[PDB]
PDB file of N, CA and C in Angstrom:
ATOM      1  N   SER G   1     -11.597 -39.897  12.053  1.00  0.00           N
ATOM      2  CA  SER G   1     -10.791 -39.007  12.879  1.00  0.00           C
ATOM      3  C   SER G   1      -9.997 -38.007  12.053  1.00  0.00           C
ATOM      4  N   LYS G   2      -9.902 -38.210  10.740  1.00  0.00           N
ATOM      5  CA  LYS G   2      -9.125 -37.335   9.872  1.00  0.00           C
ATOM      6  C   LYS G   2      -9.983 -36.624   8.833  1.00  0.00           C
ATOM      7  N   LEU G   3     -11.301 -36.614   8.998  1.00  0.00           N
ATOM      8  CA  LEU G   3     -12.153 -35.919   8.047  1.00  0.00           C
ATOM      9  C   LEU G   3     -11.878 -34.418   8.104  1.00  0.00           C
ATOM     10  N   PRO G   4     -11.826 -33.733   6.958  1.00  0.00           N
ATOM     11  CA  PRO G   4     -11.620 -32.280   6.991  1.00  0.00           C
ATOM     12  C   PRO G   4     -12.868 -31.529   7.428  1.00  0.00           C
ATOM     13  N   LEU G   5     -13.121 -31.503   8.733  1.00  0.00           N
ATOM     14  CA  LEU G   5     -14.278 -30.791   9.255  1.00  0.00           C
ATOM     15  C   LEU G   5     -13.991 -29.299   9.331  1.00  0.00           C
ATOM     16  N   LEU G   6     -15.043 -28.496   9.197  1.00  0.00           N
ATOM     17  CA  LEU G   6     -14.906 -27.048   9.132  1.00  0.00           C
ATOM     18  C   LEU G   6     -16.006 -26.402   9.960  1.00  0.00           C
ATOM     19  N   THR G   7     -15.631 -25.426  10.779  1.00  0.00           N
ATOM     20  CA  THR G   7     -16.570 -24.686  11.608  1.00  0.00           C
ATOM     21  C   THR G   7     -16.995 -23.401  10.905  1.00  0.00           C
ATOM     22  N   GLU G   8     -17.944 -22.698  11.523  1.00  0.00           N
ATOM     23  CA  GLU G   8     -18.442 -21.455  10.947  1.00  0.00           C
ATOM     24  C   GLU G   8     -17.433 -20.318  11.041  1.00  0.00           C
ATOM     25  N   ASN G   9     -16.341 -20.498  11.779  1.00  0.00           N
ATOM     26  CA  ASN G   9     -15.293 -19.492  11.867  1.00  0.00           C
ATOM     27  C   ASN G   9     -14.096 -19.800  10.977  1.00  0.00           C
ATOM     28  N   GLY G  10     -14.115 -20.916  10.254  1.00  0.00           N
ATOM     29  CA  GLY G  10     -13.036 -21.214   9.328  1.00  0.00           C
ATOM     30  C   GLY G  10     -11.695 -21.279  10.030  1.00  0.00           C
ATOM     31  N   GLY G  11     -10.702 -20.628   9.440  1.00  0.00           N
ATOM     32  CA  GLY G  11      -9.373 -20.594  10.009  1.00  0.00           C
ATOM     33  C   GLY G  11      -8.394 -21.469   9.258  1.00  0.00           C
ATOM     34  N   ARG G  12      -7.168 -21.496   9.778  1.00  0.00           N
ATOM     35  CA  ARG G  12      -6.084 -22.272   9.180  1.00  0.00           C
ATOM     36  C   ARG G  12      -6.201 -23.714   9.659  1.00  0.00           C
ATOM     37  N   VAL G  13      -7.019 -24.485   8.940  1.00  0.00           N
ATOM     38  CA  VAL G  13      -7.287 -25.878   9.271  1.00  0.00           C
ATOM     39  C   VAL G  13      -7.368 -26.687   7.984  1.00  0.00           C
ATOM     40  N   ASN G  14      -6.955 -27.951   8.080  1.00  0.00           N
ATOM     41  CA  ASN G  14      -7.076 -28.910   6.981  1.00  0.00           C
ATOM     42  C   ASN G  14      -6.201 -28.529   5.788  1.00  0.00           C
ATOM     43  N   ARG G  15      -4.908 -28.334   6.037  1.00  0.00           N
ATOM     44  CA  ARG G  15      -3.952 -28.114   4.962  1.00  0.00           C
ATOM     45  C   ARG G  15      -3.329 -29.436   4.531  1.00  0.00           C
ATOM     46  N   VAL G  16      -3.019 -29.545   3.239  1.00  0.00           N
ATOM     47  CA  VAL G  16      -2.514 -30.778   2.648  1.00  0.00           C
ATOM     48  C   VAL G  16      -1.303 -30.463   1.777  1.00  0.00           C
ATOM     49  N   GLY G  17      -0.615 -31.528   1.358  1.00  0.00           N
ATOM     50  CA  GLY G  17       0.513 -31.419   0.455  1.00  0.00           C
ATOM     51  C   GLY G  17       0.419 -32.442  -0.664  1.00  0.00           C
ATOM     52  N   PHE G  18       1.435 -32.423  -1.526  1.00  0.00           N
ATOM     53  CA  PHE G  18       1.462 -33.268  -2.712  1.00  0.00           C
ATOM     54  C   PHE G  18       2.866 -33.821  -2.920  1.00  0.00           C
ATOM     55  N   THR G  19       2.977 -34.770  -3.852  1.00  0.00           N
ATOM     56  CA  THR G  19       4.224 -35.478  -4.105  1.00  0.00           C
ATOM     57  C   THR G  19       4.275 -35.921  -5.561  1.00  0.00           C
ATOM     58  N   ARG G  20       5.487 -36.191  -6.045  1.00  0.00           N
ATOM     59  CA  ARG G  20       5.689 -36.734  -7.382  1.00  0.00           C
ATOM     60  C   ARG G  20       6.884 -37.680  -7.364  1.00  0.00           C
ATOM     61  N   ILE G  21       6.962 -38.520  -8.395  1.00  0.00           N
ATOM     62  CA  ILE G  21       7.984 -39.553  -8.518  1.00  0.00           C
ATOM     63  C   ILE G  21       8.637 -39.429  -9.887  1.00  0.00           C
ATOM     64  N   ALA G  22       9.869 -39.925  -9.997  1.00  0.00           N
ATOM     65  CA  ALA G  22      10.628 -39.895 -11.241  1.00  0.00           C
ATOM     66  C   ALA G  22      11.025 -41.309 -11.648  1.00  0.00           C
ATOM     67  N   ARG G  23      10.856 -41.623 -12.930  1.00  0.00           N
ATOM     68  CA  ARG G  23      11.242 -42.904 -13.507  1.00  0.00           C
ATOM     69  C   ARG G  23      12.359 -42.681 -14.518  1.00  0.00           C
ATOM     70  N   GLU G  24      13.167 -43.713 -14.753  1.00  0.00           N
ATOM     71  CA  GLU G  24      14.281 -43.575 -15.680  1.00  0.00           C
ATOM     72  C   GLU G  24      14.606 -44.909 -16.337  1.00  0.00           C
ATOM     73  N   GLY G  25      15.275 -44.820 -17.483  1.00  0.00           N
ATOM     74  CA  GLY G  25      15.752 -45.985 -18.205  1.00  0.00           C
ATOM     75  C   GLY G  25      16.824 -45.570 -19.185  1.00  0.00           C
ATOM     76  N   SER G  26      17.643 -46.540 -19.588  1.00  0.00           N
ATOM     77  CA  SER G  26      18.816 -46.242 -20.400  1.00  0.00           C
ATOM     78  C   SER G  26      18.988 -47.294 -21.486  1.00  0.00           C
ATOM     79  N   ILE G  27      19.811 -46.952 -22.484  1.00  0.00           N
ATOM     80  CA  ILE G  27      20.056 -47.823 -23.629  1.00  0.00           C
ATOM     81  C   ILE G  27      21.408 -48.509 -23.483  1.00  0.00           C
ATOM     82  N   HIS G  28      21.596 -49.587 -24.243  1.00  0.00           N
ATOM     83  CA  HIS G  28      22.834 -50.354 -24.251  1.00  0.00           C
ATOM     84  C   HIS G  28      23.184 -50.730 -25.685  1.00  0.00           C
ATOM     85  N   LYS G  29      24.401 -51.236 -25.870  1.00  0.00           N
ATOM     86  CA  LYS G  29      24.959 -51.487 -27.192  1.00  0.00           C
ATOM     87  C   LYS G  29      25.299 -52.963 -27.360  1.00  0.00           C
ATOM     88  N   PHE G  30      25.054 -53.483 -28.563  1.00  0.00           N
ATOM     89  CA  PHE G  30      25.268 -54.887 -28.882  1.00  0.00           C
ATOM     90  C   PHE G  30      25.855 -55.000 -30.282  1.00  0.00           C
ATOM     91  N   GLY G  31      26.461 -56.149 -30.564  1.00  0.00           N
ATOM     92  CA  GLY G  31      26.938 -56.423 -31.910  1.00  0.00           C
ATOM     93  C   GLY G  31      27.834 -57.642 -31.934  1.00  0.00           C
ATOM     94  N   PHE G  32      27.912 -58.253 -33.115  1.00  0.00           N
ATOM     95  CA  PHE G  32      28.812 -59.375 -33.355  1.00  0.00           C
ATOM     96  C   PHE G  32      29.128 -59.431 -34.844  1.00  0.00           C
ATOM     97  N   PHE G  33      30.149 -60.214 -35.188  1.00  0.00           N
ATOM     98  CA  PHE G  33      30.646 -60.271 -36.558  1.00  0.00           C
ATOM     99  C   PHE G  33      31.201 -61.658 -36.850  1.00  0.00           C
ATOM    100  N   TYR G  34      31.568 -61.869 -38.114  1.00  0.00           N
ATOM    101  CA  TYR G  34      32.253 -63.081 -38.545  1.00  0.00           C
ATOM    102  C   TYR G  34      33.192 -62.739 -39.696  1.00  0.00           C
ATOM    103  N   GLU G  35      34.160 -63.623 -39.929  1.00  0.00           N
ATOM    104  CA  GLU G  35      35.233 -63.400 -40.888  1.00  0.00           C
ATOM    105  C   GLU G  35      35.328 -64.563 -41.867  1.00  0.00           C
ATOM    106  N   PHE G  36      35.888 -64.288 -43.045  1.00  0.00           N
ATOM    107  CA  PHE G  36      36.009 -65.291 -44.095  1.00  0.00           C
ATOM    108  C   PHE G  36      37.163 -64.922 -45.016  1.00  0.00           C
ATOM    109  N   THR G  37      37.611 -65.905 -45.794  1.00  0.00           N
ATOM    110  CA  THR G  37      38.633 -65.705 -46.812  1.00  0.00           C
ATOM    111  C   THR G  37      38.012 -65.771 -48.204  1.00  0.00           C
ATOM    112  N   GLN G  38      38.781 -65.317 -49.194  1.00  0.00           N
ATOM    113  CA  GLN G  38      38.321 -65.380 -50.577  1.00  0.00           C
ATOM    114  C   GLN G  38      38.184 -66.822 -51.048  1.00  0.00           C
ATOM    115  N   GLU G  39      39.126 -67.685 -50.659  1.00  0.00           N
ATOM    116  CA  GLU G  39      39.063 -69.083 -51.067  1.00  0.00           C
ATOM    117  C   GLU G  39      37.848 -69.780 -50.469  1.00  0.00           C
ATOM    118  N   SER G  40      37.499 -69.440 -49.228  1.00  0.00           N
ATOM    119  CA  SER G  40      36.344 -70.056 -48.585  1.00  0.00           C
ATOM    120  C   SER G  40      35.052 -69.776 -49.337  1.00  0.00           C
ATOM    121  N   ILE G  41      35.032 -68.758 -50.188  1.00  0.00           N
ATOM    122  CA  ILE G  41      33.882 -68.451 -51.029  1.00  0.00           C
ATOM    123  C   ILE G  41      34.047 -69.026 -52.429  1.00  0.00           C
ATOM    124  N   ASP G  42      35.218 -68.825 -53.038  1.00  0.00           N
ATOM    125  CA  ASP G  42      35.396 -69.171 -54.443  1.00  0.00           C
ATOM    126  C   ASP G  42      35.415 -70.679 -54.658  1.00  0.00           C
ATOM    127  N   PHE G  43      36.109 -71.420 -53.799  1.00  0.00           N
ATOM    128  CA  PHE G  43      36.282 -72.852 -53.994  1.00  0.00           C
ATOM    129  C   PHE G  43      35.224 -73.693 -53.294  1.00  0.00           C
ATOM    130  N   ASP G  44      34.335 -73.082 -52.519  1.00  0.00           N
ATOM    131  CA  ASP G  44      33.292 -73.839 -51.844  1.00  0.00           C
ATOM    132  C   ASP G  44      32.281 -74.380 -52.848  1.00  0.00           C
ATOM    133  N   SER G  45      31.735 -75.558 -52.536  1.00  0.00           N
ATOM    134  CA  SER G  45      30.778 -76.192 -53.436  1.00  0.00           C
ATOM    135  C   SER G  45      29.535 -75.338 -53.623  1.00  0.00           C
ATOM    136  N   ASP G  46      29.046 -74.719 -52.555  1.00  0.00           N
ATOM    137  CA  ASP G  46      27.804 -73.958 -52.575  1.00  0.00           C
ATOM    138  C   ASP G  46      28.120 -72.506 -52.918  1.00  0.00           C
ATOM    139  N   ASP G  47      27.610 -72.043 -54.061  1.00  0.00           N
ATOM    140  CA  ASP G  47      27.815 -70.658 -54.465  1.00  0.00           C
ATOM    141  C   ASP G  47      26.887 -69.691 -53.743  1.00  0.00           C
ATOM    142  N   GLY G  48      25.933 -70.193 -52.965  1.00  0.00           N
ATOM    143  CA  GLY G  48      25.063 -69.377 -52.150  1.00  0.00           C
ATOM    144  C   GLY G  48      25.442 -69.311 -50.691  1.00  0.00           C
ATOM    145  N   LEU G  49      26.691 -69.635 -50.356  1.00  0.00           N
ATOM    146  CA  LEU G  49      27.100 -69.736 -48.958  1.00  0.00           C
ATOM    147  C   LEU G  49      26.931 -68.408 -48.224  1.00  0.00           C
ATOM    148  N   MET G  50      27.352 -67.308 -48.851  1.00  0.00           N
ATOM    149  CA  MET G  50      27.299 -66.014 -48.179  1.00  0.00           C
ATOM    150  C   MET G  50      25.866 -65.586 -47.891  1.00  0.00           C
TER     151      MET G  50
ATOM    152  N   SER Y   1     -11.873  58.731  41.779  1.00  0.00           N
ATOM    153  CA  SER Y   1     -10.474  58.746  42.187  1.00  0.00           C
ATOM    154  C   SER Y   1      -9.540  58.289  41.076  1.00  0.00           C
ATOM    155  N   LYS Y   2     -10.076  57.715  39.999  1.00  0.00           N
ATOM    156  CA  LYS Y   2      -9.263  57.185  38.910  1.00  0.00           C
ATOM    157  C   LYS Y   2      -9.576  57.837  37.569  1.00  0.00           C
ATOM    158  N   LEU Y   3     -10.204  59.008  37.566  1.00  0.00           N
ATOM    159  CA  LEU Y   3     -10.473  59.691  36.311  1.00  0.00           C
ATOM    160  C   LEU Y   3      -9.164  60.187  35.700  1.00  0.00           C
ATOM    161  N   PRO Y   4      -9.038  60.192  34.369  1.00  0.00           N
ATOM    162  CA  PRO Y   4      -7.794  60.699  33.751  1.00  0.00           C
ATOM    163  C   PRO Y   4      -7.774  62.221  33.659  1.00  0.00           C
ATOM    164  N   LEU Y   5      -7.645  62.867  34.814  1.00  0.00           N
ATOM    165  CA  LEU Y   5      -7.598  64.322  34.857  1.00  0.00           C
ATOM    166  C   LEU Y   5      -6.280  64.823  34.284  1.00  0.00           C
ATOM    167  N   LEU Y   6      -6.350  65.896  33.499  1.00  0.00           N
ATOM    168  CA  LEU Y   6      -5.194  66.464  32.817  1.00  0.00           C
ATOM    169  C   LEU Y   6      -5.044  67.919  33.234  1.00  0.00           C
ATOM    170  N   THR Y   7      -3.847  68.288  33.680  1.00  0.00           N
ATOM    171  CA  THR Y   7      -3.585  69.657  34.088  1.00  0.00           C
ATOM    172  C   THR Y   7      -3.141  70.497  32.892  1.00  0.00           C
ATOM    173  N   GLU Y   8      -2.906  71.782  33.155  1.00  0.00           N
ATOM    174  CA  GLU Y   8      -2.516  72.718  32.110  1.00  0.00           C
ATOM    175  C   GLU Y   8      -1.125  72.440  31.554  1.00  0.00           C
ATOM    176  N   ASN Y   9      -0.320  71.621  32.231  1.00  0.00           N
ATOM    177  CA  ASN Y   9       1.058  71.366  31.832  1.00  0.00           C
ATOM    178  C   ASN Y   9       1.262  69.969  31.254  1.00  0.00           C
ATOM    179  N   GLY Y  10       0.191  69.206  31.055  1.00  0.00           N
ATOM    180  CA  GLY Y  10       0.337  67.879  30.477  1.00  0.00           C
ATOM    181  C   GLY Y  10       1.214  66.987  31.335  1.00  0.00           C
ATOM    182  N   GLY Y  11       2.171  66.323  30.692  1.00  0.00           N
ATOM    183  CA  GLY Y  11       3.097  65.437  31.373  1.00  0.00           C
ATOM    184  C   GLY Y  11       2.775  63.974  31.130  1.00  0.00           C
ATOM    185  N   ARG Y  12       3.615  63.121  31.717  1.00  0.00           N
ATOM    186  CA  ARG Y  12       3.452  61.670  31.619  1.00  0.00           C
ATOM    187  C   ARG Y  12       2.462  61.226  32.691  1.00  0.00           C
ATOM    188  N   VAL Y  13       1.181  61.257  32.326  1.00  0.00           N
ATOM    189  CA  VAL Y  13       0.097  60.950  33.248  1.00  0.00           C
ATOM    190  C   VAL Y  13      -0.998  60.199  32.505  1.00  0.00           C
ATOM    191  N   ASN Y  14      -1.645  59.275  33.216  1.00  0.00           N
ATOM    192  CA  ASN Y  14      -2.789  58.530  32.688  1.00  0.00           C
ATOM    193  C   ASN Y  14      -2.380  57.600  31.548  1.00  0.00           C
ATOM    194  N   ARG Y  15      -1.305  56.845  31.757  1.00  0.00           N
ATOM    195  CA  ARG Y  15      -0.924  55.810  30.806  1.00  0.00           C
ATOM    196  C   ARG Y  15      -1.724  54.540  31.071  1.00  0.00           C
ATOM    197  N   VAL Y  16      -2.048  53.815  30.000  1.00  0.00           N
ATOM    198  CA  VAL Y  16      -2.877  52.620  30.081  1.00  0.00           C
ATOM    199  C   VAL Y  16      -2.230  51.504  29.267  1.00  0.00           C
ATOM    200  N   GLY Y  17      -2.760  50.293  29.448  1.00  0.00           N
ATOM    201  CA  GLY Y  17      -2.311  49.129  28.712  1.00  0.00           C
ATOM    202  C   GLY Y  17      -3.495  48.339  28.188  1.00  0.00           C
ATOM    203  N   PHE Y  18      -3.184  47.232  27.516  1.00  0.00           N
ATOM    204  CA  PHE Y  18      -4.200  46.391  26.899  1.00  0.00           C
ATOM    205  C   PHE Y  18      -3.835  44.927  27.093  1.00  0.00           C
ATOM    206  N   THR Y  19      -4.823  44.058  26.884  1.00  0.00           N
ATOM    207  CA  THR Y  19      -4.670  42.630  27.124  1.00  0.00           C
ATOM    208  C   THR Y  19      -5.457  41.847  26.082  1.00  0.00           C
ATOM    209  N   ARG Y  20      -5.015  40.615  25.831  1.00  0.00           N
ATOM    210  CA  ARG Y  20      -5.709  39.701  24.936  1.00  0.00           C
ATOM    211  C   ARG Y  20      -5.658  38.298  25.524  1.00  0.00           C
ATOM    212  N   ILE Y  21      -6.590  37.455  25.082  1.00  0.00           N
ATOM    213  CA  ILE Y  21      -6.739  36.094  25.582  1.00  0.00           C
ATOM    214  C   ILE Y  21      -6.717  35.139  24.398  1.00  0.00           C
ATOM    215  N   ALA Y  22      -6.288  33.904  24.648  1.00  0.00           N
ATOM    216  CA  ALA Y  22      -6.221  32.871  23.622  1.00  0.00           C
ATOM    217  C   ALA Y  22      -7.125  31.705  23.999  1.00  0.00           C
ATOM    218  N   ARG Y  23      -8.017  31.334  23.085  1.00  0.00           N
ATOM    219  CA  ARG Y  23      -8.866  30.163  23.247  1.00  0.00           C
ATOM    220  C   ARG Y  23      -8.317  29.018  22.405  1.00  0.00           C
ATOM    221  N   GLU Y  24      -8.674  27.792  22.779  1.00  0.00           N
ATOM    222  CA  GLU Y  24      -8.211  26.633  22.032  1.00  0.00           C
ATOM    223  C   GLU Y  24      -9.205  25.489  22.164  1.00  0.00           C
ATOM    224  N   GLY Y  25      -9.128  24.566  21.210  1.00  0.00           N
ATOM    225  CA  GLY Y  25      -9.939  23.364  21.235  1.00  0.00           C
ATOM    226  C   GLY Y  25      -9.341  22.316  20.327  1.00  0.00           C
ATOM    227  N   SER Y  26      -9.558  21.051  20.678  1.00  0.00           N
ATOM    228  CA  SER Y  26      -8.964  19.930  19.967  1.00  0.00           C
ATOM    229  C   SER Y  26     -10.040  18.980  19.458  1.00  0.00           C
ATOM    230  N   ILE Y  27      -9.616  18.053  18.603  1.00  0.00           N
ATOM    231  CA  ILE Y  27     -10.484  17.017  18.063  1.00  0.00           C
ATOM    232  C   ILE Y  27     -10.031  15.667  18.605  1.00  0.00           C
ATOM    233  N   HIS Y  28     -10.950  14.705  18.577  1.00  0.00           N
ATOM    234  CA  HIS Y  28     -10.689  13.368  19.091  1.00  0.00           C
ATOM    235  C   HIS Y  28     -11.266  12.337  18.132  1.00  0.00           C
ATOM    236  N   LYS Y  29     -10.807  11.098  18.286  1.00  0.00           N
ATOM    237  CA  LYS Y  29     -11.121  10.011  17.370  1.00  0.00           C
ATOM    238  C   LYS Y  29     -12.042   9.008  18.051  1.00  0.00           C
ATOM    239  N   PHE Y  30     -13.056   8.552  17.318  1.00  0.00           N
ATOM    240  CA  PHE Y  30     -14.062   7.637  17.840  1.00  0.00           C
ATOM    241  C   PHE Y  30     -14.320   6.524  16.835  1.00  0.00           C
ATOM    242  N   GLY Y  31     -14.863   5.414  17.332  1.00  0.00           N
ATOM    243  CA  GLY Y  31     -15.282   4.334  16.460  1.00  0.00           C
ATOM    244  C   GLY Y  31     -15.617   3.038  17.171  1.00  0.00           C
ATOM    245  N   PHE Y  32     -16.402   2.189  16.513  1.00  0.00           N
ATOM    246  CA  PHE Y  32     -16.732   0.867  17.030  1.00  0.00           C
ATOM    247  C   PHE Y  32     -17.183   0.000  15.863  1.00  0.00           C
ATOM    248  N   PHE Y  33     -17.274  -1.305  16.116  1.00  0.00           N
ATOM    249  CA  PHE Y  33     -17.536  -2.269  15.055  1.00  0.00           C
ATOM    250  C   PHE Y  33     -18.215  -3.502  15.635  1.00  0.00           C
ATOM    251  N   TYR Y  34     -18.632  -4.394  14.739  1.00  0.00           N
ATOM    252  CA  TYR Y  34     -19.151  -5.698  15.125  1.00  0.00           C
ATOM    253  C   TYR Y  34     -18.793  -6.703  14.040  1.00  0.00           C
ATOM    254  N   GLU Y  35     -18.768  -7.977  14.425  1.00  0.00           N
ATOM    255  CA  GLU Y  35     -18.386  -9.068  13.543  1.00  0.00           C
ATOM    256  C   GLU Y  35     -19.555 -10.024  13.352  1.00  0.00           C
ATOM    257  N   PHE Y  36     -19.419 -10.904  12.362  1.00  0.00           N
ATOM    258  CA  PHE Y  36     -20.446 -11.893  12.075  1.00  0.00           C
ATOM    259  C   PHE Y  36     -19.874 -12.942  11.134  1.00  0.00           C
ATOM    260  N   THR Y  37     -20.434 -14.145  11.206  1.00  0.00           N
ATOM    261  CA  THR Y  37     -20.065 -15.240  10.322  1.00  0.00           C
ATOM    262  C   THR Y  37     -21.082 -15.369   9.194  1.00  0.00           C
ATOM    263  N   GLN Y  38     -20.710 -16.143   8.173  1.00  0.00           N
ATOM    264  CA  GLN Y  38     -21.626 -16.393   7.065  1.00  0.00           C
ATOM    265  C   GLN Y  38     -22.828 -17.212   7.520  1.00  0.00           C
ATOM    266  N   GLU Y  39     -22.604 -18.190   8.402  1.00  0.00           N
ATOM    267  CA  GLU Y  39     -23.703 -19.017   8.888  1.00  0.00           C
ATOM    268  C   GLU Y  39     -24.718 -18.186   9.661  1.00  0.00           C
ATOM    269  N   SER Y  40     -24.247 -17.197  10.423  1.00  0.00           N
ATOM    270  CA  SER Y  40     -25.158 -16.349  11.182  1.00  0.00           C
ATOM    271  C   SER Y  40     -26.091 -15.555  10.278  1.00  0.00           C
ATOM    272  N   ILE Y  41     -25.771 -15.439   8.995  1.00  0.00           N
ATOM    273  CA  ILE Y  41     -26.629 -14.764   8.026  1.00  0.00           C
ATOM    274  C   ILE Y  41     -27.471 -15.761   7.244  1.00  0.00           C
ATOM    275  N   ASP Y  42     -26.842 -16.813   6.719  1.00  0.00           N
ATOM    276  CA  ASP Y  42     -27.542 -17.711   5.806  1.00  0.00           C
ATOM    277  C   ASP Y  42     -28.548 -18.587   6.540  1.00  0.00           C
ATOM    278  N   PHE Y  43     -28.188 -19.082   7.723  1.00  0.00           N
ATOM    279  CA  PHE Y  43     -29.044 -20.005   8.455  1.00  0.00           C
ATOM    280  C   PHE Y  43     -29.996 -19.309   9.420  1.00  0.00           C
ATOM    281  N   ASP Y  44     -29.897 -17.993   9.574  1.00  0.00           N
ATOM    282  CA  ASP Y  44     -30.788 -17.277  10.477  1.00  0.00           C
ATOM    283  C   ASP Y  44     -32.204 -17.227   9.913  1.00  0.00           C
ATOM    284  N   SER Y  45     -33.182 -17.247  10.821  1.00  0.00           N
ATOM    285  CA  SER Y  45     -34.581 -17.237  10.404  1.00  0.00           C
ATOM    286  C   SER Y  45     -34.931 -15.955   9.660  1.00  0.00           C
ATOM    287  N   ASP Y  46     -34.434 -14.819  10.137  1.00  0.00           N
ATOM    288  CA  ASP Y  46     -34.760 -13.523   9.558  1.00  0.00           C
ATOM    289  C   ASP Y  46     -33.724 -13.165   8.498  1.00  0.00           C
ATOM    290  N   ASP Y  47     -34.192 -12.911   7.276  1.00  0.00           N
ATOM    291  CA  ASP Y  47     -33.301 -12.533   6.186  1.00  0.00           C
ATOM    292  C   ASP Y  47     -32.951 -11.049   6.193  1.00  0.00           C
ATOM    293  N   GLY Y  48     -33.598 -10.248   7.036  1.00  0.00           N
ATOM    294  CA  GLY Y  48     -33.308  -8.830   7.119  1.00  0.00           C
ATOM    295  C   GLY Y  48     -32.442  -8.464   8.307  1.00  0.00           C
ATOM    296  N   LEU Y  49     -31.741  -9.452   8.867  1.00  0.00           N
ATOM    297  CA  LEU Y  49     -30.984  -9.227  10.095  1.00  0.00           C
ATOM    298  C   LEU Y  49     -29.895  -8.177   9.896  1.00  0.00           C
ATOM    299  N   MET Y  50     -29.157  -8.268   8.787  1.00  0.00           N
ATOM    300  CA  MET Y  50     -28.041  -7.354   8.562  1.00  0.00           C
ATOM    301  C   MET Y  50     -28.524  -5.915   8.448  1.00  0.00           C
TER     302      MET Y  50
END
């Protein structure tokens, strides 16, 4: 019932349209840290602690 | 009875006049046409139709 049929006289028949879509995404921020003292390094048994 | 007879004393006698006529003519516009489809040419038995 929706086939674009055409007669020998043509005319303004079977017009169509188009569409488009948009996608999006965003970034975020992360981080963490730790703290220490000089003694916690110098007097510790393991010299490879850091 | 209407001859321009002139006497020995002349005078204001036998005066005449003249006339002219104007002719005219105009032009007119004519025309006619016919239509046809592509199928009436391509699918017709006779290729010399046009």
